[PDB]
Amino acid sequence: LLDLIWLETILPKTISLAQMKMSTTITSQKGLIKLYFLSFLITILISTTLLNFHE
Amino acid sequence: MTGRQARAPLQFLPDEARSLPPPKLTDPRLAYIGFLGYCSGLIDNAIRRRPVLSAGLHRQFLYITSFVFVGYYLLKRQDYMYAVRDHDMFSYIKSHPEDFPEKDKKTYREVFEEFHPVR
Amino acid sequence: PTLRWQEDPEPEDENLYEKNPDSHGYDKDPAVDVWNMRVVFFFGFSIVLVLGSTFVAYLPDYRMQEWARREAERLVKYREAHGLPLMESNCFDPSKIQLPED
Amino acid sequence: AKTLLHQYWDIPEGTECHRKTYAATSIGGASGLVVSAYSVALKTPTSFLEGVARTGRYTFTAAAIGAIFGLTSCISAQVREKPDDPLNYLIGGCAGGLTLGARTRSYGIGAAACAYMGLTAALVKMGQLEGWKVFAEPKV
Amino acid sequence: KFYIQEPPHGSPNWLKVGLTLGTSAFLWIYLIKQHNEDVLEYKRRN
Amino acid sequence: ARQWQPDVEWAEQYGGAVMYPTKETAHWKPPPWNDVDPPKDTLVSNLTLNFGPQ
Amino acid sequence: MLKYIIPTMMLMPLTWLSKNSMIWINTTLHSLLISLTSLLLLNQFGDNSLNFSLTFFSDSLSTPLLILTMWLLPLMLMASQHHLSKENLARKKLFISMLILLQLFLIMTFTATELIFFYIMFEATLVPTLIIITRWGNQTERLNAGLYFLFYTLAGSLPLLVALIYIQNTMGSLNFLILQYWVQPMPNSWSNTFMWLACMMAFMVKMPLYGLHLWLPKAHVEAPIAGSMVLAAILLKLGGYGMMRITLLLNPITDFMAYPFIMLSLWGMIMTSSICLRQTDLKSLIAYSSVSHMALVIVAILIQTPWSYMGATALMIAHGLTSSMLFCLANSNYERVHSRTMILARGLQTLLPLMAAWWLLASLTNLALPPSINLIGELFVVMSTFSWSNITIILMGLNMVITALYSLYMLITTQRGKHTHHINNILPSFTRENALMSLHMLPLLLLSLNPKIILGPLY
Amino acid sequence: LQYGPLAYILGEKTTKKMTENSKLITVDGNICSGKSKLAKEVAEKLGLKHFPEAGIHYADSTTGDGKPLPVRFSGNCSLEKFYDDPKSNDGNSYRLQAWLYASRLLQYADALEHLLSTGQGVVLERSIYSDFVFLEAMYRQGFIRKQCVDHYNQVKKVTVCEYLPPHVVIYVDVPVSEVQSRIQKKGNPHEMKITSAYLQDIENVYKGTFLPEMSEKCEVLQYSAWEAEDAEKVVEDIQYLKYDKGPWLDQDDRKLHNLRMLVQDKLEVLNYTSIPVFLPEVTIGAHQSDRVFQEFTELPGRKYRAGYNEDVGDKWIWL
Amino acid sequence: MSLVYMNIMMAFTVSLTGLLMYRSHLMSSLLCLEGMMLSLFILATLMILNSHFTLASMMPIILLVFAACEAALGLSLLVMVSNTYGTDYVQNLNLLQC
Amino acid sequence: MNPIILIIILMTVMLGTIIVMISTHWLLIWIGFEMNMLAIIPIMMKKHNPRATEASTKYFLTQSTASMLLMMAIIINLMFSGQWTVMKLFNPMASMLMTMALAMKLGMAPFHFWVPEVTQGIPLSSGLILLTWQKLAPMSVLYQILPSINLDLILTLSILSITIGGWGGLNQTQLRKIMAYSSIAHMGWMTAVLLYNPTMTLLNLIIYIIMTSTMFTLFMANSTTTTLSLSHTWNKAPIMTILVLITLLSMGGLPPLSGFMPKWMIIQEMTKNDSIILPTLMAITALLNLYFYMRLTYSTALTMFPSTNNMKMKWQFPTTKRMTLLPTMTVLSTMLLPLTPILSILE
């Protein structure tokens, strides 16, 4: 228990599964470019009204 | 650093560089560049399936000549750049006296130290 | 109806004996094995091992040891001869000090 | 916005409660609206009703994270009265992580959320109390 | 010997190797001249 | 040669379209080696016109 | 020490343009010449170090470790045939030149002035061992072993660089002598604790500490023998060397934040000495043995006593020698039975009547038999830790009992009593293997006669 | 050598080497009938270069010396084992088929490269389209699992669809019993051991799929068994052949430049030979590949860029 | 502040949002690019005429000749897209999957 | 595609980048970016297939909308203080729009969704030349307009660009998308240091362009798009293996190799400021973007996959491609650790 399988579940598993989930949510996109320009739109609006950048 | 000889835009070396000594013979950095040139010749013989360390000796001497020449000019410009950095630093030292005070170097007779004895 | 591979059943027990039972440890060239015997049994045991043993048997006074012996002998003889207590405390001068006072 | 995260730093620490907790709910709901805007712009939820439902889930969960964090911060600061140690916000980050595990209805992800959120929140208070500047000097 | 229908090269030309050796020796002569000029300039200015 | 070598199932892992599968990765396909996807037929624009009687 | 550096650069291309059936004698002879050359350096007298223009100096923190590395190189090399003998001449030259490059960066690492240069040469030590163990590891997860190795050593060792740049631009240059002379204590703030935690944590991962020691055992069971001995002896003792170098600065807060690390290393020492009792896979027993001894080393380093540092370097040198030897005998047994598993290879008392004597002598040096330098190290560390807390001697002696128990069990299990009468392929032991035995242990006993050399700079 | 785009621009052209002698005439047909007899007759009576039997060791014959290396380096086809027993679990049909495909693609590129080099036209036998038909026929016999046919079909979709077809196809038709009589009279027992339904499927596919799907591209000359062995009539029919159909009439110049500077440096063509799909009959494992490549590179002729290979020449390695 | 500048900046921002969100026609995307060209044109020209800075009236003519040749390039690309497919929809571009 | 016309179009790419480098007038910079776009469209579609058509479509739309947003920034700049010098700006709103237009152009994490799409379907020559020049040229403009940038903008884009280019790179079993995600990570690094000492960023530009040149030269040496083909180029070409080993470890950033001099000098002149938590976060993410390099190196040379034959046929024909300048760029990219005081060659 305490050495092998529990250290393999504390350090490598949590990090590795977090990187696996973030990779399989980021790169798992399809080719509808309307979505990417909507991301551009919400990036411009979050830059204007959420956090001040000209101020 | 921003020029500070932002007048001549690509003066590669002024007459200001002709007062410091150039990089001398058998300095170790140019010898390192020459060994890197020989390694470039070795791997160029390696890729083209011709025998390594053979039949490309004019290309060996070509690569060594080219890298030693380029590294020589780079060393010259390098030493000029560090020299002008040093000289501008010392000009700003000698310019403003009062922002750089001589710290009154108290000897250890009176400089107290917290001790915290470790056991 | 499937194999997934093609390679041969390899290797075999290529015994380093059954050919040259006089031979020493490594591979099948029966001259350079004798040369390896020569180099690792003259340059590991003959010229390195006992020479290093006699080098560490006596080298100069590593970390100033016998110097420290004789200097301590002479200094304790001094501090017997002058009657002052040997190894007075306060190695630094008790006058040459500045305590931060209240 | 920088003005209301500065409002979250504006409360003495210390306690002026209902206000620190409302600022925490506002920050969490703003972050949840950000993440819900990304997740509705990158998915095509098909259709608008499910988009409203997903945005409601992400905003309500992030605001509940902010609420529970502000609650346990306020209570720990009232009880133990120590603005030096960030151990109060260590407890706060673990409480937020366990409630994130409750809102996702898993246990392993919740325990990892306790660990990571507790350590990062203790780091935030620890670096604020010693003083580590935000993003820049920007001088030399 | 052993080849069929040509050796493509292996028998080199006699302009490329002469060109490379010529420009290499030329660059060596130029850098030696550069170093002599620089030592002369340094010892003339200081 | 008695040493372990990577094999057909490691080769199947390090291939396909993307490495790590999801519930949504079935729509991805490995790319064509020509990088060409030829076949489609466009004859809907065989557009008619009645050059008529009058 | 540039007279040590430039013959290593003049040894490598000789192996490249060495002809067939002549790589071996050339490399072995010239590395033994390097061993006499290494023996010339031992001169460290009295008050100061022995310095050399800016890059180089020598202390007894570095001199026996350097002699250990350059003595270990021919032993390393002569372990490293007969398991790549049927491979190509070019790949053989590539492997041997890779080991020579690794030795070169190790000498660079032990003869370092600045800790920045120490960091560069630290991950220069890191890089070739990756390629060696992952290419020639000879099992199905040498991949996983090399990957865990590289990611733990980078991901621990990396913020150490940022802390070193911070010490650079807060105290001027980073000579060890200036840091002896310009140091000042940094009190119990929080950022002091973070900088100390980053530096010591990088080294903790290199040790390995008990929290992150899953690093080691895959990289020992899934490596060739040269990289095995390099990995264990020189990398773990290099980590301890680096901690001994950096801990001269930042004294006043280690009393406040060393209490988790000492505790973790003690209880992990007990748990690791218990876990290397009952496992299979005979190779791995010595791996967790090395984990247990380096945990003892860590406790010794951080309790900050001159007795503790003398015993620490003694335990480092003794365990490097013993673990390298015992790895080589494990490779001999794996040459015999093609197993790596413990309970299969049995007997070896009728068969191989003097290979058993080297197994016995190695396990007795591991046991801390009293002329072994292992016992000198363990004894000084026990004296210092009983001065440290007056009750933690029970964990020390329980470690002592269990250590003798598992080492002697590893002896008598496989190598006391009955062949399984189906092995029937062992040949009598080669002169090469016995040559590696008498190259391990004769310097151990002849160092055990007059061991005043190997004790630390606090002589 | 020196050929490229810079030599193209600084040089004249690639166009003015046309026409009426530079052409791809391709006599194809059934086994044991359409071979070197009629092809070397037309190579005689037309004044136009020829290529021999494109078999296993053509890749040996194309470079160095033309020595047929053994089947550990040029195989592992075992053609005589294929004619003895084409049923083995260990894989003997498809490795032979893919090797024939790659070697015929090599000789086809040789023919097209020498055609683009100024002329003067070539006569070919048993090109790669016929190899496609050959594998489809021995799949109809039931000798290859259909997944591996799909592998070959993916290879054929990738490679040939960016090249040019030949100019003319001269088909030979000989029935079953006359092929059996000629293959008796040749005397090879391994040739006799092939079965009759195999030839029947070759006939069925090679008449009902190839000659239809030519479809006035690669204009044809379909001769029977009784009307053959006359170089005069077929060379007269080739000079009858007005050149008006197919992709060869419109290039214009630039795609010919692409083919000239693409067919050279033949590993460029060989990029798409092995895909790989990993093929449980084709992929040789690691150990065998290692010792085969080493025991290939200790041959004295093929030893690292034979133009610079010591003990073969070229007596100039500059001291 | 010259109040007409407000409506022209408003027209720019609306043309930008129209460029970003779009239903199916890439033709309409090129069309909103042309409109955004016109918006920057009119704003820069009214700037130059308020300033009387008539040495540099190069902004209008050169900005719109360049952005119009950009629009011509886009139109030829749309010709090629509608050639190698049936239509020019945003759908049937989802191949070359990321 | 007549080769004279190809030399013309390459000279116009050179001309667009030089016009960007050379002027003080803002409209000339916009002309340079636009001419770069116009000529970098037909370096793509060197083949026929419609993958290149859709990639050129997506690239054209995003590149032109970034250029128009930059023109908006210049026009609002001259609504305010009216000068045609490339200097410190005089509007925070125009600096906002200008940084976001350059962020859309050279690739940042909210703005990078076109980069693996454009690099997937195109040939390697077009991909190499667009990565080199389209990540070169706006660094000149950024170097010029650095004294008037809100640091939150560049810093947030740089942090998020490094972590997105890291997190995306772990999954792709292609090669061009691995290289594109690595490009996004390095552009985040090359932007993150801009407001502190830009000699670091421009020397990072030099080193990154040398590295990408060696990478795409070693992939022009053998037409490989998957790692399966990399294993078969292990079995057919042995020196390619150890060069992929050394250059992939150099893209990793390991100290005795020359991939370290970019990162560590950046961390030096970064942590001479009071930012410590951010360099340790960034460099832990630079530990994160190394695993796909490790599995790539495993698939090439450290392990030996089973190889399809017809390499038995291919062994008679050596590597008879063309190499741009492989050995010089290689040993300049790999053995350049001890020349860290060639930092100051730049200015």
PDB file of C-alpha atoms in Angstrom, chain B residues 15 18-25 50 57-59 61-62 64-66 68-69 72-73 76, chain E residues 9 16-17 20-21 23-25 27-28 30-32 34-35 37-39 41-42 44-46:
ATOM      1  CA  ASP B  15      37.034  54.378 -34.303  1.00  0.00           C
ATOM      2  CA  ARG B  18      40.223  50.979 -32.541  1.00  0.00           C
ATOM      3  CA  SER B  19      41.575  51.811 -29.077  1.00  0.00           C
ATOM      4  CA  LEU B  20      41.023  48.499 -27.298  1.00  0.00           C
ATOM      5  CA  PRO B  21      43.164  45.486 -28.263  1.00  0.00           C
ATOM      6  CA  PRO B  22      41.708  42.922 -30.681  1.00  0.00           C
ATOM      7  CA  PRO B  23      41.267  39.262 -29.688  1.00  0.00           C
ATOM      8  CA  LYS B  24      44.729  37.749 -29.710  1.00  0.00           C
ATOM      9  CA  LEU B  25      46.119  34.583 -31.238  1.00  0.00           C
ATOM     10  CA  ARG B  50      30.740   9.698 -47.855  1.00  0.00           C
ATOM     11  CA  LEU B  57      39.376  17.825 -46.680  1.00  0.00           C
ATOM     12  CA  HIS B  58      38.860  20.950 -48.772  1.00  0.00           C
ATOM     13  CA  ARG B  59      35.399  21.184 -47.207  1.00  0.00           C
ATOM     14  CA  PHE B  61      39.393  23.533 -44.310  1.00  0.00           C
ATOM     15  CA  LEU B  62      36.597  25.669 -45.791  1.00  0.00           C
ATOM     16  CA  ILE B  64      37.219  25.858 -40.320  1.00  0.00           C
ATOM     17  CA  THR B  65      38.230  29.037 -42.185  1.00  0.00           C
ATOM     18  CA  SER B  66      34.662  30.363 -42.291  1.00  0.00           C
ATOM     19  CA  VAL B  68      37.196  31.136 -37.374  1.00  0.00           C
ATOM     20  CA  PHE B  69      36.703  34.301 -39.454  1.00  0.00           C
ATOM     21  CA  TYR B  72      36.875  36.548 -34.864  1.00  0.00           C
ATOM     22  CA  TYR B  73      34.658  39.435 -35.925  1.00  0.00           C
ATOM     23  CA  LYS B  76      35.859  41.931 -31.706  1.00  0.00           C
TER      24      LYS B  76
ATOM     25  CA  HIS E   9      30.433  11.636 -59.329  1.00  0.00           C
ATOM     26  CA  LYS E  16      34.940  23.747 -57.292  1.00  0.00           C
ATOM     27  CA  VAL E  17      37.843  22.462 -55.179  1.00  0.00           C
ATOM     28  CA  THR E  20      37.016  26.648 -52.302  1.00  0.00           C
ATOM     29  CA  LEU E  21      40.749  26.438 -51.573  1.00  0.00           C
ATOM     30  CA  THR E  23      38.642  31.654 -51.263  1.00  0.00           C
ATOM     31  CA  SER E  24      39.743  29.882 -48.075  1.00  0.00           C
ATOM     32  CA  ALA E  25      43.389  30.913 -48.426  1.00  0.00           C
ATOM     33  CA  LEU E  27      40.144  34.703 -46.285  1.00  0.00           C
ATOM     34  CA  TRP E  28      43.074  33.487 -44.160  1.00  0.00           C
ATOM     35  CA  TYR E  30      42.684  38.767 -45.202  1.00  0.00           C
ATOM     36  CA  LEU E  31      42.242  37.927 -41.511  1.00  0.00           C
ATOM     37  CA  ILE E  32      46.022  37.877 -40.950  1.00  0.00           C
ATOM     38  CA  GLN E  34      43.314  42.457 -40.454  1.00  0.00           C
ATOM     39  CA  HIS E  35      45.085  41.349 -37.281  1.00  0.00           C
ATOM     40  CA  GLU E  37      46.408  46.260 -39.073  1.00  0.00           C
ATOM     41  CA  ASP E  38      44.681  46.061 -35.685  1.00  0.00           C
ATOM     42  CA  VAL E  39      47.909  45.506 -33.734  1.00  0.00           C
ATOM     43  CA  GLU E  41      46.456  50.633 -34.893  1.00  0.00           C
ATOM     44  CA  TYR E  42      46.482  49.720 -31.199  1.00  0.00           C
ATOM     45  CA  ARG E  44      49.896  53.600 -32.868  1.00  0.00           C
ATOM     46  CA  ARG E  45      47.027  54.971 -30.784  1.00  0.00           C
ATOM     47  CA  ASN E  46      48.331  53.922 -27.373  1.00  0.00           C
TER      48      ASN E  46
END
